[PDB]
Design a protein around this ligand. Structure first.
Ligand SMILES: Nc1cc(-c2cccnc2)n[nH]1
Ligand SMILES: Nc1cc(-c2cccnc2)n[nH]1
Ligand SMILES: [Cl-]
Ligand SMILES: [Cl-]
Lengths: 286, 286
């Protein structure tokens, strides 16, 4: 009881659903190559604007866009699907795999912040794996909730005498420009789930409200589970799941952390990178 | 070394400067009536959008707009000029006059908030008097810094499970939707200046920083000055200059305050209103 717009249909051959909410597999007619088409029912203009400008190997790339009776966003296909499907229902990833994926999430999020973009909705369902192999490339998706940086409204206000300026505004100055720390919290919640198989904060088998657990920063620590996990890995989690956003670890601090000082891991990612990049490598000036 | 655009020039005869920063007096050709033309050098689109939709006797009305090499905003002329020029350099207004003007500022700001608009830059230089008479109509101007309401970004976020939501975001929930209280602070600083002739917070003859005076909410109280002012008037000032924005008086609470329960004042404003409105009164169905 619905059709695809003529414009989309002219360029792509639509196929099977990859993930409803919907995301469909499609074939670009010109190349005969698999693509992914994200259908948004009728903020998307901001998302396209962000996507088009951003260029990193661990951030999803926009290939095409259709503004019809619904929104159609053509993206590169990720054959591994969602990271969520690897962690769902107490399923746990090996420490090495966690590092390989985490490192990439850190590089991706560092890039975003470097470029003044805050994702705001990082989750295992927004981290996509490139292949059905455990040693693969990851890419960050869903820039729907993303925000463009600048405390510009406060900065403009501060340029004047605060004769008439309310105290709450002068108070906010202390915290202002730490909105990006929300993404480091999120990564910290992601890293906990990956390593343990379980969430740090939940309403399962507890009296304390999800709100209170988070505000206090008192995560559920199950020793039996974490015993199979290194002290370095847990130290990093502890460093990102810090209530004070000014005290919280940045992507830079996390990347400098001992847990990430792994040359084997760094080499594997570089090998996966060159493997992807080998297909489109133009001969070069020597 | 500059000219007015042909489009503006086709409709208006530009005249003398009313206030630089610039604001010029002009004559609408069709009516031979005095107008005020605000020239902004190349947010104005938001300001026009707000102005066009808002309709209250104590809020400036937009008559025309020109988007040229500069921005030109045609507004109703206010022959009394800025309220700032009545309070500048220890000059003080009589209590009755303060009430008449304050009441109108409260009605104007109530309207804004009722309609989901926060002015954000209320000052005596943004309050315009209709005539050179002390008993006159006032109108609120400069919607440049104004913001359109809705905690929509937090509201959208709260619709989900906060498994991955940062604690600072859950903390902000307590305060969220009290941004309008910034305008009540501002009015409170305005009312202090009008009644006393002096500002509540300044770096003049004091050790404590302007920031600290405001954050603490410790205004400069000079008894000798305020002795000539009623306890009701000062009680209202004390009620608006409250550090906690949740505890601070709203426009509704202020309008309900004993100081404003003045039928003589309310009658005078109504008489000034009908006097302005008499010119454009269409005969009506009886
Ligand atoms: N852009 C993109 C989305 C997807 C996907 C794959 C499987 C399930 N859900 C989403 N792949 N590539
Ligand atoms: N719209 C408007 C502005 C002004 C004005 C008058 C005098 C000084 N500064 C501004 N009258 N009416
Ligand atoms: Cl179809
Ligand atoms: Cl000219």
């Amino acid at each position: 009881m619905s059709v695809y717009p003529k414009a989309l249909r002219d360029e792509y051959i639509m196929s099977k659903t990859l993930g409803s909410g919907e995301v469909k597999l499609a074939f670009e007619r010109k190349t005969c190559k698999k693509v992914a088409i994200k259908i948004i029912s009728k903020n998307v203009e901001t998302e396209i604007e962000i996507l088009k400008k951003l260029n990193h190997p661990c951030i999803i790339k926009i290939k095409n866009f259709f503004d019809a009776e619904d929104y159609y966003i053509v993206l590169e296909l990720m054959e591994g699907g969602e990271l969520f499907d690897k962690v769902v229902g107490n399923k746990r990833l090996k420490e090495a795999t966690c590092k390989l994926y985490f490192y990439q999430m850190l590089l991706a999020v560092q890039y975003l912040h470097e470029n003044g973009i805050i994702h705001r909705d990082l989750k295992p369902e927004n981290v996509l794996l490139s292949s059905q192999e455990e040693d693969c490339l990851i890419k960050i998706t869903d820039f729907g909730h993303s925000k463009i940086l600048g405390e510009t409204s406060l900065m403009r206000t501060l340029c004047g005498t605060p004769t008439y300026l309310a105290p709450e505004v002068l108070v906010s100055v202390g915290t202002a420009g730490y909105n990006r720390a929300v993404d480091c919290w999120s990564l910290g919640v992601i890293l906990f789930i990956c390593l343990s198989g379980y969430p740090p904060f939940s309403e399962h088998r507890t009296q304390v409200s999800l709100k209170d657990q988070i505000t206090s920063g008192k995560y559920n620590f199950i020793p039996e589970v974490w015993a199979e996990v290194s002290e370095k890995a847990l130290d990093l989690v502890k460093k990102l799941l810090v209530v004070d956003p000014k005290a919280r670890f940045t992507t830079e601090e996390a990347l400098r952390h001992p847990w990430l000082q792994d040359e084997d891991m760094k080499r594997k990612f570089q090998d996966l990178l060159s493997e992807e990049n080998e297909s489109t490598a133009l001969p070069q000036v020597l």
